């Protein structure tokens, strides 16, 4: 499907970064931020692309009711079972002292990420990929 | 393809910030309390499509510096001239708003609502836009 989602956290600078992946393309979205933070980043995502699956590998997600609501509203399907939060991290490294917030460093990171090419050079990068997926199934 | 308009508009006491695909009609949308919030926002929307070129039709936005650094760092085009999208958006909010808490909810279940109704919807639409062009 072109809607399959991984949902996932990493932590730096003592924060909170929620982390989604469209694992066909390797296309992500990130957010430094609880249940109501989640379900308003999952509503976000799911307004803008196809969201249909959200994989999670713990169990912080099932027991909050507002996630569970989002869910039901935008008619995503949270489903257990399953770096590239190391990839991200280490982007943000490069990149951490042109932003004095780091969830400006997060975004230029995830920014990076998406329209880079794999090795530096030729094929699609992942915005690319998550399009052409979506192009193609429509 | 690459080309965006943006705007603000106002409910309940706050300020929701307004991205709009030009040729698809898909929306982005956030509440600030709110030039760094803008910034922020443009960096964020400049991630995950092509923004080459933003319309603004005031002078609120040449006279930040965060936002000209943005631009700057993303590669983006600040334009003037920006030839009632924020009032078809404030009906659909109208349409939710009972069923969320926060305004910002509401206005996110709003986009969600504009970017996938209908032939294509904007959300189809921009990435039919962007798929041809990657082909082209
Ligand atoms: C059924 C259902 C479904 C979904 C649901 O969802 C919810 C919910 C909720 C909830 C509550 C509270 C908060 C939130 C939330 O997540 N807000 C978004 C977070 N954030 C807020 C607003 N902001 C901020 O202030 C903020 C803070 C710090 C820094 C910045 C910046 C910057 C910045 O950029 C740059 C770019 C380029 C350059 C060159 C420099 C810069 C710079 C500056 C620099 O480096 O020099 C912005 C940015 C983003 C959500 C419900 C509950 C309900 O309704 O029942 C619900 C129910």
Redesign the interface.
């Known amino acids: 499907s072109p809607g399959i989602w991984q949902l996932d956290c990493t932590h730096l600078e003592g924060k909170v970064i929620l982390v989604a992946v469209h694992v066909a393309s390797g296309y992500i ?1 990130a957010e430094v931020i609880t249940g109501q933070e989640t379900a ?1 980043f999952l ?2 995502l ?3 692309w196809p969201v249909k699956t959200v994989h999670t590998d713990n169990g912080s997600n099932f027991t909050s009711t507002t996630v569970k609501a989002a869910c039901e ?2 008619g995503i399907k949270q489903e257990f079972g399953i770096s590239m939060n190391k990839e991200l991290k280490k982007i943000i490294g490069q990149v951490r002292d ?1 932003a004095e ?1 780091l ?2 460093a997060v ?2 990171a ?2 990076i990420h ?2 880079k090419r794999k090795g530096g050079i030729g094929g ?1 990068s992942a ?2 990929r998550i ?2 997926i ?3 199934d ?1």
């Open positions: 979205e308003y509503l976000k799911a307004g803008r509203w935008a042109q917030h969830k400006t975004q230029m995830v920014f998406n329209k699609y915005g690319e399009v052409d979506i192009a193609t429509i």
